[PDB]
Design a protein around this ligand. Structure first.
Ligand SMILES: N[C@@H](CCC(=O)N[C@@H](CS)C(=O)NCC(=O)O)C(=O)O
Ligand SMILES: N[C@@H](CCC(=O)N[C@@H](CS)C(=O)NCC(=O)O)C(=O)O
Lengths: 208, 203
């Protein structure tokens, strides 16, 4: 194998969960071998590192792999003292992980909708799409209310929360050109504005 | 006091229940039923998913991973999540793997609940495969161990239990206590726990 191997982060160009991981990596200022991957492919078999078959996976120099994104992001925030993506104080930290679950949950709902539309032409269910896009709208409204008088999601400091909300919104933009959220959720668009101003964030926009 | 929204069969919620019991925490239990409308769930979790913990703040916490962490810091004297970073990460990662197998298993059930006319063959194969791979890995990781991490009972063990519990409910056909001996042992040891058997699905 190889000496002086860096941590490797398996990822795809569209995965918002991968993006959350990449963004945290940059914020922590951690050097990481970022490996663009194709899930189907034989040459890099994800299943050998993540049995679930899901990206992102962080493969450490031991050859031991961490997934899912929620685990990986706790691991990395502890690597360097650059910033506390996850607050040390328990109140703030549960607050941070709650935001993140809301954001990931909305993303799960969008992925659900999106994939639902990709089913074979016969076996596709408009109700499923409706329900999921329902979770999205409700989640967005809630986040938007929570950012009325706030610079950032928690305690007024950039955290995993903000990152998660960014990756989420960016996912919406990627998958739903016609969603005009910015206008409907002014606090969120403002937040997204701040986020778009970070290389970490902007440097990782989905593509392809 | 606090309110837990759960259902009879949710393994995600059974995980919090088991934690609460393990931790000796007295949560007001709020039954949700599958035919139920969006609220009261959606009122407290915008994603309208169970489980969700409500605090005397009215504040609501979700999902199960967030709740268990909040629950575990409630009673200091005994942690189901290691305070030490390395053991914490390894536990969270067992949980992630177990939740993920539950995910795939629930999805396949859901794909089997579709109009026979709108079932995707590829999806069920695809999810099951995930299941066995999750189980194969998990049954080797336990090859010479009693508990998942540092040979001491943790959230990881609870997660593994609920997961298999869920397969106990929805996948009779699988003979996994047969291919995954270590999982079998883990389950029986889990079974023997009050916290675990009081939270099994009523049928
Ligand atoms: N719970 C996992 C989910 C990982 C996941 O879903 N990754 C891929 C699927 S393998 C993804 O983002 N797919 C959606 C897309 O790229 O559009 C995590 O949070 O990391
Ligand atoms: N991933 C979450 C939620 C799990 C979940 O989806 N629970 C199901 C019951 S088994 C649910 O409430 N589904 C309702 C819906 O998606 O509308 C967790 O670990 O708490």
């Amino acid at each position: 194998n190889l000496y002086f191997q860096s941590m490797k982060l398996l990822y795809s160009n569209t995965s918002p969960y991968a993006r959350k991981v990449r963004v945290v990596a940059a914020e922590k200022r951690i050097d990481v071998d970022m490996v663009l991957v194709v899930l189907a492919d034989p040459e890099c078999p994800v299943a050998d590192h993540n049995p679930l078959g899901k990206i992102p996976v962080l493969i450490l120099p031991d050859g031991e792999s961490l997934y899912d994104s929620r685990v990986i992001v706790e691991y990395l925030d502890h690597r360097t003292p650059v910033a506390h993506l996850i607050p040390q104080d328990h109140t703030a930290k549960i607050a941070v992980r709650r935001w993140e679950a809301l954001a990931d949950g909305v993303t799960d709902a969008a992925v659900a909708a999106v994939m639902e539309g990709r089913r074979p032409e016969g076996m596709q269910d408009s109700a499923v799409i409706e329900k999921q896009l329902n979770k999205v709208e409700r989640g967005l409204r809630r986040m938007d209310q929570d950012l009325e008088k706030r610079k950032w999601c928690v305690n007024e400091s950039f955290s995993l929360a903000d990152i998660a909300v960014g990756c989420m919104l960016g996912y919406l933009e990627l998958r739903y050109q016609h969603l005009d959220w910015k206008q409907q959720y002014p606090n969120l668009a403002r937040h997204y504005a701040a986020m778009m101003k970070r290389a970490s964030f902007k440097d990782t926009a989905p593509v392809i």
